[PDB]
Amino acid sequence: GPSFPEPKVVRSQGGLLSLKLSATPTPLAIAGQRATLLTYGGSFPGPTLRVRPRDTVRLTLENRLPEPTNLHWHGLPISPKVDDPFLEIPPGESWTYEFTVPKELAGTFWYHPHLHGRVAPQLFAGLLGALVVESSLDAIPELREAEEHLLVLKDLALQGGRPAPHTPMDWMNGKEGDLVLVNGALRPTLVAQKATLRLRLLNASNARYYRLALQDHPLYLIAADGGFLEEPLEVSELLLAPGERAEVLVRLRKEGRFLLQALPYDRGAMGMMDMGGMAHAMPQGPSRPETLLYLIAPKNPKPLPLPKALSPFPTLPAPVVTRRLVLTEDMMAARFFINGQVFDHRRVDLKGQAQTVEVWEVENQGDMDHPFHLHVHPFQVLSVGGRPFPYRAWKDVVNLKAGEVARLLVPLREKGRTVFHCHIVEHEDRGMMGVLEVG
Amino acid sequence: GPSFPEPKVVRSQGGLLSLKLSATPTPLAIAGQRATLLTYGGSFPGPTLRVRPRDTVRLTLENRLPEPTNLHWHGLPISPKVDDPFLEIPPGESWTYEFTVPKELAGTFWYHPHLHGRVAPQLFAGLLGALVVESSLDAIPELREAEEHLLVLKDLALQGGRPAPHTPMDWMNGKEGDLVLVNGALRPTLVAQKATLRLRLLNASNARYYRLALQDHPLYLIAADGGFLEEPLEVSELLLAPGERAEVLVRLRKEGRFLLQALPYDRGAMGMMDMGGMAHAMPQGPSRPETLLYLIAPKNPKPLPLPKALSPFPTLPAPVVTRRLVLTEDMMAARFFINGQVFDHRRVDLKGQAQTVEVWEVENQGDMDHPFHLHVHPFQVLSVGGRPFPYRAWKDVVNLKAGEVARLLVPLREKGRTVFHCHIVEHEDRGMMGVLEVG
Numbered sequence: 001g002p003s004f005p006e007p008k009v010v011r012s013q014g015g016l017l018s019l020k021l022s023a024t025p026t027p028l029a030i031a032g033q034r035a036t037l038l039t040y041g042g043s044f045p046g047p048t049l050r051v052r053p054r055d056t057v058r059l060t061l062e063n064r065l066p067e068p069t070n071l072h073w074h075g076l077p078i079s080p081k082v083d084d085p086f087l088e089i090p091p092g093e094s095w096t097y098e099f100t101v102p103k104e105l106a107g108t109f110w111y112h113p114h115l116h117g118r119v120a121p122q123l124f125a126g127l128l129g130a131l132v133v134e135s136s137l138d139a140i141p142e143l144r145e146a147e148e149h150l151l152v153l154k155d156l157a158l159q160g161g162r163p164a165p166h167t168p169m170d171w172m173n174g175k176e177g178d179l180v181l182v183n184g185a186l187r188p189t190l191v192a193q194k195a196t197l198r199l200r201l202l203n204a205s206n207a208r209y210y211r212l213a214l215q216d217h218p219l220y221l222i223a224a225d226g227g228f229l230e231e232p233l234e235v236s237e238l239l240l241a242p243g244e245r246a247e248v249l250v251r252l253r254k255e256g257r258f259l260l261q262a263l264p265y266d267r268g269a270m271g272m273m274d275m276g277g278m279a280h281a282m283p284q285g286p287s288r289p290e291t292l293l294y295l296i297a298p299k300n301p302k303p304l305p306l307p308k309a310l311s312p313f314p315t316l317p318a319p320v321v322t323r324r325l326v327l328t329e330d331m332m333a334a335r336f337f338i339n340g341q342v343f344d345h346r347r348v349d350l351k352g353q354a355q356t357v358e359v360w361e362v363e364n365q366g367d368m369d370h371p372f373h374l375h376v377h378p379f380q381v382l383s384v385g386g387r388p389f390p391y392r393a394w395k396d397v398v399n400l401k402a403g404e405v406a407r408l409l410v411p412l413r414e415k416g417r418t419v420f421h422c423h424i425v426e427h428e429d430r431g432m433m434g435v436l437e438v439g
Numbered sequence: 440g441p442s443f444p445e446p447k448v449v450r451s452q453g454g455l456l457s458l459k460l461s462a463t464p465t466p467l468a469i470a471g472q473r474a475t476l477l478t479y480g481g482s483f484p485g486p487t488l489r490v491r492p493r494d495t496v497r498l499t500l501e502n503r504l505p506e507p508t509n510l511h512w513h514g515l516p517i518s519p520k521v522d523d524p525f526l527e528i529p530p531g532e533s534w535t536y537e538f539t540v541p542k543e544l545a546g547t548f549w550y551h552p553h554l555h556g557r558v559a560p561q562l563f564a565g566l567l568g569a570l571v572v573e574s575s576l577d578a579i580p581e582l583r584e585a586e587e588h589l590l591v592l593k594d595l596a597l598q599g600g601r602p603a604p605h606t607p608m609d610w611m612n613g614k615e616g617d618l619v620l621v622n623g624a625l626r627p628t629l630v631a632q633k634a635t636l637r638l639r640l641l642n643a644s645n646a647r648y649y650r651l652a653l654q655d656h657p658l659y660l661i662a663a664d665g666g667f668l669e670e671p672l673e674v675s676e677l678l679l680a681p682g683e684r685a686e687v688l689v690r691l692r693k694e695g696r697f698l699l700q701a702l703p704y705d706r707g708a709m710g711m712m713d714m715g716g717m718a719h720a721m722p723q724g725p726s727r728p729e730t731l732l733y734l735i736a737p738k739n740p741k742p743l744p745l746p747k748a749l750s751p752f753p754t755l756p757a758p759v760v761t762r763r764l765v766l767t768e769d770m771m772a773a774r775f776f777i778n779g780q781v782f783d784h785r786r787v788d789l790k791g792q793a794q795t796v797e798v799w800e801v802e803n804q805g806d807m808d809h810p811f812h813l814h815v816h817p818f819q820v821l822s823v824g825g826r827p828f829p830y831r832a833w834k835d836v837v838n839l840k841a842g843e844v845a846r847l848l849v850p851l852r853e854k855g856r857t858v859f860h861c862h863i864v865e866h867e868d869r870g871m872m873g874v875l876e877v878g
């Protein structure tokens with residue numbers, strides 16, 4: 001196949017993407033080994049769905065797992081009556097998700113399970129895929145002439161030819177695996193044919209962070225989770241927390257081999273030690289560095305100029321309410337809280353008004369990083385840790401290190417009941433989720 | 440007695456004002472005629488209660504009326520478990536109100552009935568009195584040396600020696616009477632002994648407005664409903680809507696007689712006409728001018744200098760929510776609404792958080808003036824009709840002319856369920872009231 005493995009793409013046809021996908025245990029070859037994973041569409045990752053604004057999506061999910069499951073259309077500002085976090089598809093049963101892609105939308109999104117208490121094992125086992133919304137902006141020469149690739153960043157651990165089971169420590173920290181893969185491949189080689197690359201990045205890991213850096217090169221950030229920036233932003237590195245997406249341009253500077261790495265990063269994961277009267281928690285410290293892929297530049301690279309502009313960010317109405325959402329931890333219990341409570345699907349935590357804007361202050365009072373996700377209503381990050389964000393773009397996950405406060409501008413869009421939760425999915429399963437009702 | 444009639448004063452003693460008051464039909468002489476009014480403490484107005492911050496008030500109300508009644512401590516930022524708008528004292532029964540006067544408080548307040556559906560006839564019949572909170576500011580020479588008087592502005596209409604009954608038109612407009620009285624007296628004479636007067640003003644009328652102007656003189660506004668301004672404000676006239684209070688200094692300029700008048704004012708009251716195929720509503724137009732009292736200045740008046748400052752207004756925290764409350768009318772039905780609903784004591788309309796600040800935008804979409812009152816939580820009027828307020832002070836009633844929006848800064852104080860409503864009390868009785876719960 002092509003030197004660089006990427007998931008199969010399924011494209012809408014005549015404005016309709018109609019597809020039947022089964023969630024199924026699937027024997028496959030993974031990183032040189034045979035394993036049985038849980039997959040959509042018989043592959044890991046699942047197929048990439050590629051659509052345009054105003055397309056109709058009609059996706060019938062058949063559940064061939066021994067437990068119930070469902071789908072979250074992560075990042076899509078659609079109705080929570082479609083992206084329904086409370087729906088359960090029993091084993092053997094099917095459900096059809098039908099929605100129209102919003103007109104003002106572009107970027108890299110994804111789909112994965114969201115059945116409370118079962119997300120972490122299902123996601124860890126291989127149930128996820130990407131969804132790309134193509135934009136008229138993709139036609140500008142500076143993007144059209146770039147070489148485009150999707151990178152799905154997901155790690156895995158195998159035991160007896162199956163995904164390794166969750167330990168108690170896994171429920172506390174979120175599970176990370178030793179196989180650090182890109183598109184399900186182990187350190188693939190990307191042999192660039194053009195001097196400018198456009199890379200869509202997705203962190204579909206349960207808990208692993210990717211502190212991304214390309215040897216000898218900066219990255220040019222052009223989109224965040226849910227849409228384009230207003231103009232490219234040069235960065236030396238880019239941290240992608242679980243659930244986050246980004247799009248970057250890479251401008252290859254000279255011939256040669258360059259490593260794309262996940263640099264050491266300490267997300268506050270914890271171990272246990274006994275030093276002669278202990279039996280107490282101790283920091284794991286930073287992750288060991290990982291090579292994600294080998295990037296070979298072409299002969300005499302002459303990259304395109306950067307686009308001068310991307311998409312102007314909408315001017316939002318003045319906000320009508322300010323919310324405060326405090327995250328805390330009980331590590332030894334592996335319990336996680338928002339404003340002192342664990343999730344209860346029958347309990348509404350916030351009630352807001354559609355078409356108004358809110359300010360959400362989300363404060364991490366724990367010691368671990370927590371990546372905060374809100375369904376249905378993309379937001380603009382104003383600041384985190386008291387530092388103003390250096391760009392305007394739509395996001396739907398924001399990472400908070402210990403002690404940090406994020407201030408978000410949240411326009412409420414579709415009416416209905418939805419959720420917000422930590423996207424270290426173990427923490428969500430263990431209670432770190434709440435309910436927002438929009439009317 | 441003294442040329443200028445004022446209600447009897449009852450003062451706290453040793454930090455305690457303990458008093459038994461009966462609500463009772465009372466034969467009395469009023470404006471030269473014998474009438475039976477409903478009174479507190481056998482007088483009209485009721486006795487003036489005079490207290491200081493941190494005093495304890497223990498007021499036992501005995502109901503000797505043929506219908507249930509209760510008290511509203513209008514303007515007092517105390518608990519709605521004490522100032523309870525839902526409490527009913529049956530005929531023949533008694534209830535003791537006990538509270539501590541807040542430490543940061545000063546001004547002219549009042550007490551009257553608030554039993555939904557029965558307020559207008561009870562208030563019109565004579566059930567009201569003043570409460571004054573004395574302040575250490577009263578000791579500054581510029582106030583101490585002034586001649587102080589209370590003016591209770593209340594009109595009345597009599598029929599067969601009793602308060603005139605409410606007509607259907609009265610329920611629509613709010614009832615006004617032909618006897619326009621000050622402290623229950625008809626055009627009394629105030630023979631000033633000092634050149635500077637300090638007048639506490641109370642509009643205790645059901646519906647009548649007082650566009651106050653003293654012949655040949657400005658007024659110096661020094662307090663609004665619920666506290667002092669930051670410094671005196673010179674005005675040529677001063678409109679007092681139902682429920683409002685103000686304190687002014689008058690600086691007598693020369694010897695002579697000066698009329699204090701209620702100048703013509705059109706509050707949008709309506710009549711009916713038939714002009715040959717009509718039978719339709721027509722504006723009553725402005726009120727006829729009234730003389731309230733005759734003010735005789737002393738010989739060679741040399742008024743005191745004005746105080747340079749009064750009380751600094753508190754710096755409020757930034758607000759956490761914005762509310763919108765739209766007033767509308769169905770005149771021919773005599774029904775009045777807030778956000779399209781009439782009052783329901785079982786229904787909570789707004790839920791706010793104690794010790795936060797809110798912005799309330801109150802919009803009058805009717806054609807009549809509506810004076811909007813909020814219990815328990817005094818507010819700062821920021822602007823009305825798009826015009827910024829020319830002073831900072833605590834208010835608890837704000838007048839809105841047809842079409843006007845008032846923007847209020849509302850710190851939420853005591854926890855519990857309370858109400859907000861139009862203080863044309865007929866309109867409150869006919870539905871223009873809502874419920875705020877603070878937790």
Ligand SMILES: [Cu+2]
Pocket residue numbers: 072074112243423
């Ligand atoms: Cu997700």
Ligand SMILES: [Cu+2]
Pocket residue numbers: 336369370371422423424427428432
């Ligand atoms: Cu978390």
Ligand SMILES: [Cu+2]
Pocket residue numbers: 072085114373375419421
């Ligand atoms: Cu979710």
Ligand SMILES: [Cu+2]
Pocket residue numbers: 511513551682862
């Ligand atoms: Cu009142």
Ligand SMILES: [Cu+2]
Pocket residue numbers: 775808809810861862863866867871
């Ligand atoms: Cu009214």
Ligand SMILES: [Cu+2]
Pocket residue numbers: 511524553812814858860
């Ligand atoms: Cu009231």
Ligand SMILES: [O-]
Pocket residue numbers: 072074114373
């Ligand atoms: O999610």
Ligand SMILES: [O-]
Pocket residue numbers: 511513553812
């Ligand atoms: O009231």
